[PDB]
């Protein structure tokens, strides 16, 4: 968990601007989240540079910020960032788009909280680095040591079962080997998990928990934020599924009881 940032290019501060480039800029820490609302490629892929002319190159967010998770219009920045990283997302605010959303925004009759020139909107994100590796398992074959238990490091994963221990308040997770049609078991992990060999609603064990997951595949890591109070010890499981038997792994988590302060 961290601060939630937002870049909403549907707002008039962008639409009715005079400039041909309008800017939204974010200074983010690891485990922050960013929501990007564009009225017209990211977060799954992002731009390396702000200038259109040079460094037109783009990169997968997992290659740039390994350990990060994309779900919908939101990015959960990896709990571990190795290097200060800038990246950029662009929004084409053409005159048709602007006219459309100026009409859409008329639905707002007042400024209650929610509980013309063509432009190029730019979201500039700056991500600070940190030192702590992610408490969890990496089942992908690589030497990136972003997680405390990579399969590369001997003794970390035995018999294809990675045993992690989590205390109250801690963030833990795992990352399946990358592929375009891998799945997790149970499908809705962490909201459902394996407990005592049966599928179990995690809310019935550790209510108050939080999770960061992509629900469409096992492309991205799975994260669990253990609540500040855990009444008793629980051992739960999630599993990486794949037609490839080399990518079949078990994430086993020993959740300890307590009250953190
Ligand atoms: Cl998505
Ligand atoms: Cl999702
Ligand atoms: Zn999604
Ligand atoms: Zn009102
Ligand atoms: Zn709390």
Residue numbers in the entry: 19 to 58, 63 to 137, 224 to 369
Show me the paper's own sentences about this structure.
The complex P. falciparum life cycle is supported by a diverse repertoire of surface proteins including the family of 6-Cys s48/45 antigens. Pf12, Pf38, Pf41 and Pf92 are localized on the surface of the blood-stage merozoite, which is the form of the parasite that invades erythrocytes, proliferates, and causes the symptoms of malaria. On the merozoite surface, Pf12 and Pf41 are displayed as a heterodimer with Pf12 tethered to the outer membrane via a glycophosphatidylinositol (GPI) anchor and soluble Pf41 appropriately localized through its interaction with Pf12. Collectively, these data establish the architectural organization of Pf41 and define an essential role for the Pf41 ID in promoting assembly of the Pf12-Pf41 heterodimeric complex.
